[PDB]
Every structure is written in structure tokens, then in C-alpha cells.
Design a protein around this ligand. Structure first.
Ligand SMILES: CCN(CC)C(=O)/C(C#N)=C/c1cc(O)c(O)c([N+](=O)[O-])c1
Length: 425
């Protein structure tokens, strides 16, 4: 049988040094009581207002609600995608009433953990400042009494898991992760731990680090890639603040707005009307436009409104931007329509038409498939169990009658029509 080690074991500390040197633990008594209280006030402020929600993630085909409920706080405009679900940052006051105060506290905590990480990363050596530049945190909460449906840890006999074994995805390469853990009020089943294992390995015994009132641990350098980790549930309620360097190259509002603007360079923009005229019918420009169409629709709009309107409760930072992206997306439906008018006109040579079809066909087929996948995910079993606060909306969705939208939602006819023309002898 597989086994684990805790601080109570004698081999525990030689194993920390030898096989987990990139894991660092700072006890509660190293962090100031000024900051402890401020952070513990911010937890409750966000919990009372109902900012934390259980995510409806997709994982190996299945639709699952996470045991832990959570909120993402971070730089304004930044997003963090995990388990096929994009979380949107309730913003913090970065350079340049009660909910905004709580978010400022977590920025203060974030700067404190950044200092301790740069310190530890310098000590590791004897690119550092970028790989400790935490741009977001992911606050998590769970009450084991009110949420007593927890899986048993399979490999080492650690017991109930609030979160099972995994890597933190979508992080900057070799970036650190700092975690503040706060409870209320073999391994002790009543106390919250964090589990650690080497990847692919259940022979080498795992590590269970106990966490109490404000204990902080740090995943450094390649640890998160080389090792997996889980959270082990205790009996009392427990908050955590997990600070990450999110790889947000393509996951910011500034980025998606710029992409939208690049797609609309192909349309005559004197006036905003339904008569959308395109400047070029070159394969590359059209290919690019429909790729951008899919990017704004599926990575931003449907991701937002799938969780929506849960964000409106604790902030309204995203309200104006998401309306702006919907307007931009609505224009791009006109572009697709204008492309379909071009391929379906009497004056085009068959060769020109087929170059245009080859350019857009993969983008349109992907659009159909993802629309079905999203429409199915909105109307699943567990999706129709959430309250009216978090009702999985399927926006954008419009009916076959709806004459404001130029093209239909269901693209099956449009798609197979275009495939037919490409196979013509
Ligand atoms: C102890 C507090 N923590 C540690 C930081 C967490 O709550 C946590 C982590 N990590 C949650 C988490 C984050 C993810 O990005 C992710 O993909 C998954 N997952 O695969 O289910 C879980």
C-alpha cells in the first residue's frame, strides 16, 4: 500500500530537503497580525456579499461543480482560464465601497507575498522579478459541514479532498505560486492540509503539510510542473488566497479589443449600419476575420454569460466592456454574412470562390461545433440546478424568426452548402 509523511514523522524533513526543496513554508507567526486581521476581514466582507461562487467546469467530458466556491481578484482587464472556464478579475487598485476596500487589502497581501517570493527565489539560486510578479489571486472557500461530499484520496491514504491532485494550469513558465491559508477553530483528519506528490509517481510517498490560521506556502520554479498537489479537507471552514502569475498574453481585455479592431479594418466604417461592406476578399484577411469572430464569441462572450450574471453582484467593471465586445461581435456576424453574399454571387470565377471557401470553412465548422457544445453545456443536468443569481444564460442566442441578426445560430445548412461547392467537379 502507498503511504505519506507529515511533520510528526522523522523521515519527513529529510524528504522535504531531498525531493521537495522548491516547496517553502512560512508559519503564521512570521506574518504580521496587522495584515492577518485585514485579510481575515476581507474574506468575510466578500463572503457576506456573496462574491464567491462554485464554478461549473468541464473536465474529461463531464460537467462538474467544484466543491470549493471561489472568486478571482487581480489586475483590471486580466482573465484566468482553467478547466475550460475563463474567470474574470474583479479588479484591484493597481498603479494609476466595501468590496473595493477588500480588493485593495488582497493587493497589499499580494505585494507582501511578492517580496517573500523574490527573497526565497534569490536564496534558491545561491527573470526572478517577472516570475514573482503576481497579477491575480484566486480566493477559495469551503465549509466541510455544509459541503460534506468529498472524494477520498486514492494513492496514499490521505483522506477527504476539497480539491484533488493536479497542476495549476495557464501560469507563466517557471512562475511561483504563493498561498495564504486560514482555517477556523497518519494525518489529523480535523486539520486542513496540502498534499504533494511527484508526477507519475505513487511509490515515493506523498507529503501532507498541515495548515492552520494564516500559514503560507510557496511553490517555486519548476515545482508545480514536476509535482502535483491536492488540498485535504479538515472539519472546520477555511479560506485560501492563491497568488499566481497568470499567462495573460491572449487573456486581457486590451488584447481582445485590439483583435476585434484588427478584424474591423476589413470593413468600410463610415457609419454603423446593417449594410456591411468589406474592403478585401483576400483569403488571409477573411481567414483572420472569422478566427477573430470565434475568439471573441467563444473565449469571451459565451464564457462570461455562461457564469453570468454572477459578476454583477460584486462588481460592474466588465459590464461596459462585455457590451462593447457584443457590439463588435454583432458587426462580425455582418462580415460573415457579407462574405456569404460574395461567394453566392453571379460574377465570381469558380477559382476565386473556392479560395474564399477554403479560407473560411474550418472557421465556420468550428463555430457550428462550439455553438452546439456551448448550447449543450448551458442546458445540462446540473446547470439547471443553480439559483436565479447564477442561471447559465446561453447568450448570444437568437431564434430563426429573429430578423435583427443577419445569419442563423444553427449553421449546419450554411456549412454543408459551402462543403458542396468545394467538392463540385
Ligand atoms: C489550497 C488552495 N489551492 C491551492 C493553490 C486551490 O484551491 C487550487 C489550487 N491550486 C485550486 C485549483 C486551481 C486550478 O487552477 C485548477 O485547475 C484546479 N483544478 O485542477 O481543480 C484547482
Amino acid at each position: 500500500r502507498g503511504s505519506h509523511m507529515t511533520p510528526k514523522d522523522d523521515e519527513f524533513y529529510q524528504q522535504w530537503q531531498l525531493k521537495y526543496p522548491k516547496l517553502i513554508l512560512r508559519e503564521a507567526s512570521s506574518v504580521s497580525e496587522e495584515l492577518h486581521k485585514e485579510v481575515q476581514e476581507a474574506f468575510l466582507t466578500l463572503h457576506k456579499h456573496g462574491c464567491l461562487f462554485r464554478d461549473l467546469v468541464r473536465i474529461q467530458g463531464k460537467d462538474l461543480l467544484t466543491p470549493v466556491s471561489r472568486i478571482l481578484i487581480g489586475n483590471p482587464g486580466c482573465t484566468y482560464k482553467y478547466l475550460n472556464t475563463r474567470l474574470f478579475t474583479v479588479p484591484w487598485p493597481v498603479k494609476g465601497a466595501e468590496i473595493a476596500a477588500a480588493c485593495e487589502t488582497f493587493l497589499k497581501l499580494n505585494d507582501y507575498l511578492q517580496i517573500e517570493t523574490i527573497q526565497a527565489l534569490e536564496e534558491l539560486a545561491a527573470d526572478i522579478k517577472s516570475r514573482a510578479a503576481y497579477n491575480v489571486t484566486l480566493l477559495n472557500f469551503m465549509d466541510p459541514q455544509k459541503m460534506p461530499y468529498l472524494k477520498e484520496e486514492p494513492y496514499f491514504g490521505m483522506g477527504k479532498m476539497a480539491v484533488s491532485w493536479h497542476h495549476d494550469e495557464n501560469l507563466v513558465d517557471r512562475s511561483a505560486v504563493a498561498v495564504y491559508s486560514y482555517s477556523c477553530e497518519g494525518r489529523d483528519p480535523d486539520i486542513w492540509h496540502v498534499g504533494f506528490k511527484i508526477s507519475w509517481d505513487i511509490e515515493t510517498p506523498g507529503l501532507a503539510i498541515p495548515l492552520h490560521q494564516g500559514d503560507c506556502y510557496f511553490m517555486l520554479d519548476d515545482l508545480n510542473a514536476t509535482h502535483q498537489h491536492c488540498v485535504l479537507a479538515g472539519s472546520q471552514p477555511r479560506f485560501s488566497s492563491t497568488h499566481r502569475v497568470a499567462e495573460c498574453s491572449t487573456g486581457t481585455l486590451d488584447y481582445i479589443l485590439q483583435r476585434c479592431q484588427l478584424a474591423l479594418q476589413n470593413v468600410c466604417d463610415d457609419v454603423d449600419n446593417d449594410d456591411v461592406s468589406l474592403k478585401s476578399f483576400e483569403p488571409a484577411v477573411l481567414k483572420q476575420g472569422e478566427e477573430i469572430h470565434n475568439e471573441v464569441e467563444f473565449e469571451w462572450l459565451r464564457q462570461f454569460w455562461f457564469q453570468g450574471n454572477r459578476y454583477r453582484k460584486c462588481t460592474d467593471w466588465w459590464c461596459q466592456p462585455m457590451a462593447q465586445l457584443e457590439a463588435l461581435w454583432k458587426k462580425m456576424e455582418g462580415v460573415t454574412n457579407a462574405v456569404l453574399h460574395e461567394v453566392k454571387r453571379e460574377g465570381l470565377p469558380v477559382e476565386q470562390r473556392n479560395e474564399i471557401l477554403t479560407a473560411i470553412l474550418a472557421s465556420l465548422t468550428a463555430r457550428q461545433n462550439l455553438r452546439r457544445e456551448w448550447h449543450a453545456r448551458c442546458q445540462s443536468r446540473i446547470a439547471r440546478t443553480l439559483p436565479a443569481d447564477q442561471k447559465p444564460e446561453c447568450r448570444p442566442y437568437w431564434e430563426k424568426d429573429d430578423a435583427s441578426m443577419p445569419l442563423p445560430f444553427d449553421l449546419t445548412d450554411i456549412v454543408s452548402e459551402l462543403r458542396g461547392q468545394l467538392l463540385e467537379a
